[PDB]
Swiss-Prot record:
Protein purpose: Molecular chaperone that promotes the maturation, structural maintenance and proper regulation of specific target proteins involved for instance in cell cycle control and signal transduction. Undergoes a functional cycle that is linked to its ATPase activity which is essential for its chaperone activity. This cycle probably induces conformational changes in the client proteins, thereby causing their activation. Interacts dynamically with various co-chaperones that modulate its substrate recognition, ATPase cycle and chaperone function. (Microbial infection) Seems to interfere with N.meningitidis NadA-mediated invasion of human cells. Decreasing HSP90 levels increases adhesion and entry of E.coli expressing NadA into human Chang cells; increasing its levels leads to decreased adhesion and invasion.
Positions that bind ATP: N36, D78, K97, F123
Protein name as catalogued: Heat shock protein HSP 90-alpha
This protein's encoding gene: HSP90AA1
Full-sequence portion shown in this chain: 16 to 223 of 732
PTM characteristics: ISGylated.
First and last residue of the signal peptide: none
Similarity comment: Belongs to the heat shock protein 90 family.
Amino acid sequence: EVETFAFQAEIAQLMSLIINTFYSNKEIFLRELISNSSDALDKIRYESLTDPSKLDSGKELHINLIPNKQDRTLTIVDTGIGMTKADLINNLGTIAKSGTKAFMEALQAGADISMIGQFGVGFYSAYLVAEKVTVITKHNDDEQYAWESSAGGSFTVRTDTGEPMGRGTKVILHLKEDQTEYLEERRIKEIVKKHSQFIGYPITLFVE
Ligand SMILES: C[C@](O)(CCCc1ccccc1)c1cc(C(=O)N2Cc3ccc(F)cc3C2)ccc1O
């Protein structure tokens, strides 16, 4: 069973601009995804200081980059905390809450403020290079979910029956035909060095 959701109006407008722009500096999509992987890895790591059991779903904390020229996909896999179904719907489309209003609400509720920024908006830059994005994600004590969109104003969420992940997030970028440089080892190495060199987790490029 598949559920379809509309992007919030301003996010839909942003995605339309991203899809139709000739913006030159497209390589920064990778920085934005690796940065969210690193934040997800920090989260399961800090959380495992008070609850060591949260790493039963996988001890290693890392990021893998997997180009596939046959499928024309670039996959980014991390073993971070992963996303719940609510995280997918709320943060990857339907809600755009200001950090300030979220901060006020957290103060009044006595809740922590660590998520007042959601996951940001920089990751929509993936549509500079991808015509479709699939996200497979697995959070502890929740099921494995697949999120998908080709940026036509909507996205889908379904329970994933594919290969189990353990814990974390996998972003599959189905690249546009003119953006296949991001499957080239030399190009990926270059942009990791320029924009993601100081991430505090191993970033491993898989060779085809
Ligand atoms: C959002 C993404 O950036 C997915 C975006 C795909 C997409 C691309 C383009 C358009 C829509 C969606 C992303 C999310 C995650 C994840 O599991 N997080 C994030 C985070 C930050 C802090 C935190 F404390 C806990 C978590 C959980 C990992 C890698 C990612 O890369």
